[PDB]
Amino acid sequence: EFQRKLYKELVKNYNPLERPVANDSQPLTVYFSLSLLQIMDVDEKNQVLTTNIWLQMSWTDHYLQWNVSEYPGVKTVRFPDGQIWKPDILLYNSADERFDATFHTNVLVNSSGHCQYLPPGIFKSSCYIDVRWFPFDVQHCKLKFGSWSYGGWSLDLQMQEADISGYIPNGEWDLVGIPGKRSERFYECCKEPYPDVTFTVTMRRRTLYYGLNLLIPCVLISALALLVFLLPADSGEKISLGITVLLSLTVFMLLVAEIMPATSDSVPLIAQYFASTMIIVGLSVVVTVIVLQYHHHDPDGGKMPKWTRVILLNWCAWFLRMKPDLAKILEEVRYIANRFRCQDESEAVCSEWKFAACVVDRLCLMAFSVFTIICTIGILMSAPNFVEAVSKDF
Amino acid sequence: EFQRKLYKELVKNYNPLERPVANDSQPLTVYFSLSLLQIMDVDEKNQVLTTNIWLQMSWTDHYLQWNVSEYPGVKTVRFPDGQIWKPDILLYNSADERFDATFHTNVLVNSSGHCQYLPPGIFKSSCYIDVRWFPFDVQHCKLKFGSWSYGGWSLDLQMQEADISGYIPNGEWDLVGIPGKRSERFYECCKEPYPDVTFTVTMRRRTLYYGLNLLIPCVLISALALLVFLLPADSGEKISLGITVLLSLTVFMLLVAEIMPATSDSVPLIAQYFASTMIIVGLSVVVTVIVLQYHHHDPDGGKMPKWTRVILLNWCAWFLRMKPDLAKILEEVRYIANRFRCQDESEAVCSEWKFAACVVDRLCLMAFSVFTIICTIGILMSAPNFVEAVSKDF
Amino acid sequence: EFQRKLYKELVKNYNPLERPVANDSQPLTVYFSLSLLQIMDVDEKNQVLTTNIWLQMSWTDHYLQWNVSEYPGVKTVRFPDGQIWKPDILLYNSADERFDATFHTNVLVNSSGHCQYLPPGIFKSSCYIDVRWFPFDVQHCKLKFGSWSYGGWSLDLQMQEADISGYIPNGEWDLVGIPGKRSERFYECCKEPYPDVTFTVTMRRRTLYYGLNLLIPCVLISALALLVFLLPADSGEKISLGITVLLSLTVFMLLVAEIMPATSDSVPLIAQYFASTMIIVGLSVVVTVIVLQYHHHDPDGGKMPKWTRVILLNWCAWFLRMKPDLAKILEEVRYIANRFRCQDESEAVCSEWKFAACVVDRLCLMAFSVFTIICTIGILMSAPNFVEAVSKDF
Amino acid sequence: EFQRKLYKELVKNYNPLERPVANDSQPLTVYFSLSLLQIMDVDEKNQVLTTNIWLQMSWTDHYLQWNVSEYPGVKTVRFPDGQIWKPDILLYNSADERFDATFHTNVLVNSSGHCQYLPPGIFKSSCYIDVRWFPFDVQHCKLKFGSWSYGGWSLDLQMQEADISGYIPNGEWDLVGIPGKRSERFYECCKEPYPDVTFTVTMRRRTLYYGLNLLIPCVLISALALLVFLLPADSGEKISLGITVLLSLTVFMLLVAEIMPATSDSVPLIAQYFASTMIIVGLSVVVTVIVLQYHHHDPDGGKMPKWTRVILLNWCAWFLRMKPDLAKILEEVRYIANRFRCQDESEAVCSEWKFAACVVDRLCLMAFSVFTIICTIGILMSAPNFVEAVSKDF
Amino acid sequence: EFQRKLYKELVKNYNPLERPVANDSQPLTVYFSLSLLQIMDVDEKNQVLTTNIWLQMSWTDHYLQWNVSEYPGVKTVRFPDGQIWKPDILLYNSADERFDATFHTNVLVNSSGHCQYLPPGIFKSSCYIDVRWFPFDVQHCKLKFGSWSYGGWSLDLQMQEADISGYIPNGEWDLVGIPGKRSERFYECCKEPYPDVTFTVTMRRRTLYYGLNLLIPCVLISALALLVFLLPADSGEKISLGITVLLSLTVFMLLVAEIMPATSDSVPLIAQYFASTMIIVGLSVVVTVIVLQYHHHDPDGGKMPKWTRVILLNWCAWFLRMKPDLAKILEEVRYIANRFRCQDESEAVCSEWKFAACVVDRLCLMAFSVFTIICTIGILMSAPNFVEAVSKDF
């Protein structure tokens, strides 16, 4: 009886085109805020943040006011899209093909004209995603909101603190906070300035998944590449082991190339770590080739340079703690035995060259172990957020 | 004649904005429920549940009432979207870019004003998908529904049991049940509380497909890694077999990484099982390198430590039940034979070192077999739902 | 002059809400049918059938009637969506995010009120896709259609034979037929029953593509695995060949896992055939390891069990049709020759062990050939539709 | 002043439902055509042609006529969708989920009532894509257009030549032409026939990309498979080379399987060429196994059949142009030398068997070279359009 | 009070169909421009440029004028889509399924009738993407804009400089500039010409990511292929190394084939560089086979041609700076020693053939190093933009 009469009196002469203020010269105050429910996806390749957000706009409408004594029990009214004036607040850095992803809902309005409008939405926004320190990265994704066509002389956009009380954690991102800032900017379109309200979502990557799928797999494969330095040369499988580990390393390099944006603003930390690992395994194949040359050295070839027999077989070999008819028979058997003696001297030279290969294996075992550890530790702990990651996520 | 007259009388002065109650101060009771027809997809990567649902809302409309004696044969009427008041019940945790995925249909209304509204829909909802016990997991996906803009003082949302009579089974998920609960919650938006009705779909993963594509393939590949301990060392193919099985293991690790969400709330069971398997095969490559060092040991190198000739060649080798001119000719032939004797002693030392490699193969064959069985059995039967899975799905 | 006057008289007092019958108590008869133009896609992973369909609804409208003598040349009229009453027939098992995929078009209406409505559409429907016999499978995909909100007391849905005259064949599916059936069902929503009309599309998979991409590639790779039994052991490439063929077999297992739905209602025929093939190649690697143990057997190790020298070197080797100073010189040369004699006896034992490996190769060549043929033939001809496939598609 | 007055007079009593003809009994002539701007994509897997098209419809409207002397400067008027009658011409073989992909724009109308309507659009259409001769294929994709609900007694659809003046070439398809044909067909829906206008886009695949990504890579890999016949047997890498080239061949077979539709209307040319190449490399692995059996033949085994020592070591080896105490010492040394002599005869037999392997390598080098060339040339030049391709694209 | 009165007076008799000019014979001037905010994506495979753009249209409306003295404080008004006349400016080369991707917003209008309309949008446009010089390419993507249905006699489209003040850099593309040009063209549709305004976005690819993911990985793999020329032949791993590096090269060839459009307008620079690298590694496998033939040459086979013993073992070997009863015993031992002597001469011939293989390794090491460097440098520095790339991006 009363709800029917109010809806009829409130729409008399109403115009959703008119900005709802008593004095046309003043700007209309609009308080903007939002509630962050869920971070659905951070698309590092497309540089897009997907979020589930309820936006919160509130203002006063001069013409949507009634006396609750004259409409008993009628304290709030509701209006759908197009039936009352709303602020046309849009996400400026939308990455949605439709641009505006807001699902339109009612505007709630109480008897003093106070209007509340909380349209839900799944929003996609453009966010520079800084992959310099990935997977130990912190991202600061901006969500810029402002009236599209109402400047500051017409619409006084004000900011209120973001709501995270109903926020649902994500398993890949720890929300650090959603600080906001109201700015007043000029655009070359217009002489009037246009206020906006930007919310910056500070979200920290959780690193357990990436530790177990990217960082830890790489360390063990790096350790496998050092088993080439422990394989005997006579096994015949050093290059197979080494080059196969190297082919195992490209699957990870393509996994990173597939998830990282194709940008030149910097080189990700993961890229520097995988590139260094692949250069340490790629250099262990180069060293393996040199080792095999020493092991398979032709004894009747060039003698061992004196610099080599001291640098390897003395210094490094100490540091590593390795260490008438009867005369014709005589002539003929002497040839057989002398042939054996020549084979022993050639064999001794071969064993001497083989021992050099063993020393080079041990040296480059130690050398590549130090390179792996320092590069692994140095690259990973160069990230500002590495210590925080191992404390919280491990 | 009568259907035409009723549709004309029923819309006189009607307003789809007005909540349809006789006394404005009372809230309107709305019974919400749903019918689960089909679970279309559980997206574990995007944390999204897709379902085919008919929602069921029912209420009374004070103004949609007629006397069937005055409209003979006219017992029900129908109204499309926007022509009569409806409750704006929305899925709160929608994951649809449009947010609201409901296909709007008629509202059926009989002569006493009882309104029935059953819009079908394909819904996408946000569901925390707990992959801790995957593939023997049970999921509890919530579907939260409530009026967006009508609080409890206006809309008394009530719950009714979910319908599963027309439910069509899925081959990957056994519906355990769809219990629902009506809750009354406060939000920082509003001083009035807002009732909602949540339905939790309890669905058990069926594990035959994952047994045959993830778990069983892994067991056999684990068994293949133990064939390296049975390959003779002289074959020249131990590292090839071992490292190739290890490269066969990464295809599965990338298959899991591709279907699992990138989260740090826990490590899936499948991840722990594949990671342990890859550490058992990766450790069989380390042990294989040690075996080859023993087999290819230089006889003129360091002698065998006394601890090694007892631990392996006595204890473990028993447990495993393995086990003037004529003088110049004399001098020259004595060298040939003594050279042969030195070769036999060197060969005996080599065979002794080769026998150690064989014992180490058998020990690590048994040791890695126990590790594989205990890790396989221990990790799999640590799942609460493993026994149920093998009973129902196998 | 007359078309303008008819469109004006026909809309006087018309209501698209009113069901178009003269007697409100009777149900309106609606004949439903469809024309199948093209099967666009059978999505076995998502269990979705895509089809290009024109639906065919026809009924009578009491108020859309004129005398063609009074409107010369005006024999048919046309009305767009929302301007005249239509039946709200929907696909019940729609898999489209919008649910209703029908493109709305005109309703044609002649002078006696007969209405024809043929909206085209690309439809996606939920279809249980039975992959038990894939790729020799026949599918029976249902398309359930009925009025959403009009029960049987209001809408007498009747069925007419499906049109396939304009059907365009697909290269993967031979349409067997589109039988339909009208059913009358009750739902827990409603006390009134709701008729529906279901069309079952019986479509046979054409198997040439899958013969050439799945079945034939697998047979040849199975034959390659038997070449390991023909490779000499001294080549050093048996495990490389065997395990490489095994790695070639996983690419196919992942191709099947990617196109098959992740369901536990059964194991596909292709899964049983590839799993058996991979178990025959995986068992040829196990047997290869045993062969290499025989070939590389240490002659100074355990002697050959008497059961082995009869089972292999007699039975199977027949079946397969294989088959003062002068005394010091004397002492020293006798050692050299006796050392040679011991080497010959050790070599004879080695050749004896090598011959056992050759016999085992031939036995397991024959044994695995029979297993491959019987498993290949047995699994493939266990399909009811295998004989039909080779007759029609090959 | 005049544009305002014309828009007001022209809509008086106008009805967009009425077909715009003076005599209702006559059909309305509509000239249909189109402008082909760009071929966006030919989807061979989904059998869908995407094109950027402007459609061109023109007709006369009896009621949209004015005297330009009475509306000075007003020579054309414009009307948006729904405000004037339009022909409901649709693409019949649309593959778009919405079915109708036309972007609606104004209808231009001059003073004699002539209406021009050029809606742009991105269209997806169903096109049988004949992959028999891929990548040297020519496709004839039909675009069928006709009024959905207006038959020939109401709408006289006429055809005009297609415009390609603003056509923008594509790098994969050379437009050969867009011939059109107007047809008059009957459908089982209706007793009246329905004219349509079909345009067939004849487009020739440009083959440079596919020459460099499919055909040329395959030829070189085929040539690599012949290097197995040049590898010495003592290298120990024949199977590794051969089987690795075979694994290199499957990456291409899966690339083709991924881009080709899963159809059984024929076997593509590329499929026959890759299948023959893989059977020539797969047969070079079989022959390699036979070669290794000859090379590793046990000298104490079965003698060489006389047919083998003539067919290979005579004929083919000519064609290929290959080619008291002193008596105890005597007894003992005679054994040593006779043992050497037996080793030489066994070695001579081994070298004889090794020479057979070399001849078989050279024969099968020549034989597989001829097979590769004839199969490569024969399969490729069996395409009708191969000569055109190498002339235009190379 | 005044905003309400202006919105009411301004819509009296207004028609959004009427072009807003005082004199109908004159064309309406419209200034078109745009603001480039962000380049979202350059799709080289689909030939589509995605951009975030605000379009800027401005014109005068004769009927939207008021005296601000009569409406105090009312200086601007706003109108939504369909309520006032707008120019129907469309992107001509749109690649969006909807064609028009513009998000409609208000038109701002001040008291002298000046209208400003800045609809945002995410636009997809067809752009010929010239991949000839990829990854050192510069692209010139056109965005053609014009009124769809208003020709030059009605709509005088004028151009204004593009705004890039709010442009946000992209990590893959450096915006070089957005020059625009206004053109007046004729179309076969129409006798009247139709102005358009085209903006060409000149964007330079940033090459760090592609240097590290495509170019640098390829160089090192090319260097690895040269390690085959340093591996000793006795290692038994030359083909394994060589062919494995060749299989490592196909992963890159498929990565390029996946991101490049399938076009025959040219061969990309990356394609020529990878194809040359794969032909240098593929030719190092051919040369490796020849080397192994020399190393494994049968000493009892054909002698070394005199041309070979000079070209390799003299010239190239200097350039490279490589370098009664007692008579029976006598007869028997003479055989043993003469057998040894024959083995030494055969061994000397073998070592001579082995030395040739070593020289060929060193020659082809140097030769392939020069080929790699010249092909690497020559192909890369043939790009006009290579020097700019290394200066700016490295």
Ligand SMILES: *[C@@H]1O[C@H](CO)[C@@H](O)[C@H](O)[C@H]1NC(C)=O
């Ligand atoms: C505008 O109105 C004011 C007061 O009503 C008047 O003085 C002024 O002349 C008007 N301007 C025009 C251009 O008519």
Ligand SMILES: [Ca+2]
């Ligand atoms: Ca992420």
Ligand SMILES: [Ca+2]
């Ligand atoms: Ca699932």
Ligand SMILES: [Ca+2]
């Ligand atoms: Ca299919």
Ligand SMILES: [Ca+2]
């Ligand atoms: Ca194509």
Ligand SMILES: [Ca+2]
């Ligand atoms: Ca790009």
